[PDB]
Amino acid sequence: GFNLKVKDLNGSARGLTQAFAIGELKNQLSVGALQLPLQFTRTFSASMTSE
Amino acid sequence: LLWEVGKGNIDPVMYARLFFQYAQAGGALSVDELVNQFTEYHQSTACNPEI
């Protein structure tokens, strides 16, 4: 329920970011070299519960 | 052959043949290389989409 202001996460939940996902301090998040379509569209994932 | 280009659409051969004409021409030889260059060229195409 973290309420957050668009045009910031890099502060707003600072490190809850794609940037963060790099680590990436608060640089980039940009465009656009190369570009490259993939949509691997499946995952392997699980399900609820393990208790 | 003649090979008028008017509606280019794959079919290498011709092209290749031109390539050879170049290849032969010594204005291509490492024609191959050129394709690399080209690959890169292409690639750069890949790289400038935004452009």
Phi, psi of B28 (to 5 degrees): 110, 150
- Nearby residues of A5 by Cβ (< 8 Å), 6 or more positions away: A12
> How was this one solved?
cryo-EM
| Cβ–Cβ under 8 Å, residues B51 and A31 | no
- Nearby residues of B41 by Cβ (< 8 Å), 6 or more positions away: none
- How many CB atoms lie under 10 A from the CB of residue B26? 7
CA dist A14 and A24 (Å) reads: 11
Query: How far does the CA of residue A27 sit from the closest CA of chain B (Å)?
Result: 21
Tell me whether residues B46 and A35 touch, CB distance under 8 A. yes
E strand intervals along A1-51: none
- Resolution in Å, one decimal, please: 7.5
The distance from CA A42 to its chain's CA centroid, rounded to whole angstroms, is 18
Phi, psi of A22 (to 5 degrees): -70, -35
CA dist B37 and B24 (Å) reads: 18
Three-state DSSP state, B33:
helix
